Write a protein that binds this ligand. Sequence first.
Ligand SMILES: [K+]
Ligand SMILES: [K+]
Ligand SMILES: [K+]
Ligand SMILES: [K+]
Lengths: 329, 329
Amino acid sequence: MILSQQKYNYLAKVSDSNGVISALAFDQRGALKCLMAQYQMKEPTVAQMEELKVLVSEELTPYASSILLDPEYGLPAAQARDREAGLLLAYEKTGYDANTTSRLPDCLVDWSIKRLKEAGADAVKFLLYYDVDGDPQVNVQKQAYIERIGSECQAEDIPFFLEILTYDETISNNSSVEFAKVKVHKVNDAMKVFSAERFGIDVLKVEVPVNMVYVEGFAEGEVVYSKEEAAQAFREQEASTDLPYIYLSAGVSAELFQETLVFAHKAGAKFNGVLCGRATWAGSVQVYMEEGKEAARQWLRTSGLQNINELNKVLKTTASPWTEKVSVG
Amino acid sequence: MILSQQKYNYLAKVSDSNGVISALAFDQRGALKCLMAQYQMKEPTVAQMEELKVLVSEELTPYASSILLDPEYGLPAAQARDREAGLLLAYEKTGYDANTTSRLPDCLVDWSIKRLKEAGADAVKFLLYYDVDGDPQVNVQKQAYIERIGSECQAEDIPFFLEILTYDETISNNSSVEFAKVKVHKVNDAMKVFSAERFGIDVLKVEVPVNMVYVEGFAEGEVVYSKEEAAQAFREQEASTDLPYIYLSAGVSAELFQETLVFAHKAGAKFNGVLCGRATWAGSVQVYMEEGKEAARQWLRTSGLQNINELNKVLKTTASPWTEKVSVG
Ligand SMILES: [K+]
Ligand SMILES: [K+]
Ligand SMILES: [K+]
Ligand SMILES: [K+]
């Protein structure tokens, strides 16, 4: 696995001194709007959305290797980040049509990789929804789309992070037991597909392959995987790609995310860090809305800081440096 | 308690043949937008919001005495209602500033009572947030505002429904045990305040005075009220006003709402019906978004119909006619 010198340097900028991606995610758009609105039964303003991102960026990027932000609301937050923190910018439009099964990808209309680099990104993230068992023609379209982005990133010589969120065309709720029973296949086989050279991907941002709340020991109810089956799922994930890959939190609790990382490492996964969002900053939303900006700053300086510092200490003992998977050429 | 002939006739139009208000609530605006958005991680369109209201109105108003709708998205739904169903229209802007404690009221800027009557309302609903223990000057402002609306409704000779949602300036979460411990006081004393002639109110739309999930027998955890204390709370509510009053569902389950009505009646409350929303139609949102319009129609014709028919059968044995509290003069 061979990176250009420039892509290597950009990847170093979004990583810590140990060659692990210990990154903070806050590119949420519509999702954040709804999280805020619940506290007042009316929509937040643009100013409120931009300001909360600034606060999270200011207060927590001294403790992260980089931050992921959206162009729509996150550009002030990007400017406010710690000098040693790198920047990722999201390139996809959010979401999908709930009434079709295809969940096709679409880039933000005002952007190109070139423009995202010009705006200060060290790396570009694109989220793709993918069902490996879905309509083959849909998946041809998806593969073609990713090839285009991979080619843009090759030309602009900037790292391409592909985020894969799995789904099943036939299952509505990804939190269900029914989905838990197919998730390992969905996650690991999608990674296999997108490991092909033709997609130009530098880092995969992926789900852990199991739903941990259904793993023996973690399960309060039905158990879908034994501890050993879950461990096998992590080994199979590691075997599904030679690219660097990192985990998203999926908004699980800080404690569960920490436990998942420990479990992953014990099983044999050599994951290369995380792009961790809600698990770190979730509690700031209510404080910001109800108590205001300085109160939210104080939450970030206490509870947020505790969350991210605990994450960093887990990462030191669980994550593997990406420099061991990749070299310059 | 004395109503004008015209107000009496309008109230009859929004009631069933037994003189009970068996009304369907669907004036939700921002709240509905977020309920829909969760199914696709992007906002619904205006067309989608208007269409779901039409479907709910078309399919369920044959089984309700009236429907409550908002002017913003609900006017097509109002036109689509069953010929025997009356119409209520909401007059307030939704929500409040989460960062202040005053939650002051504000009418929709394009509307007046006259215009709402012209648009086809048989009655007008206004939602006020009220903390009886809050800042006395805030509560003067609130009382003055309600007096204005009461006066408009007197002039236009149309029934005024005041919805009171209680809160505590010092408690953020109304679902908490801490709020459950003050709710009876908040609800019943607010009703006492707004029973004064000067407010011109014809019907109060109010919360049940307890949080039932903390009542002995219903409680899965901590118990805040014994069954007898809860029964006393309902008697105290009935004693807090001579106006007709009806219960909102607050989005509890259909089963819990049914049980609450039975409990209320057994305790001695002579509540005069309900304006019931989410408890009836909640499940239609996911079906509409994921499976489409005709699928949502089929949900309404099956599960929705079962919900509302079960509500009507409970109402027949639990609700008291308002005609026993009020006569023409
Ligand atoms: K860095
Ligand atoms: K490998
Ligand atoms: K009627
Ligand atoms: K009374």
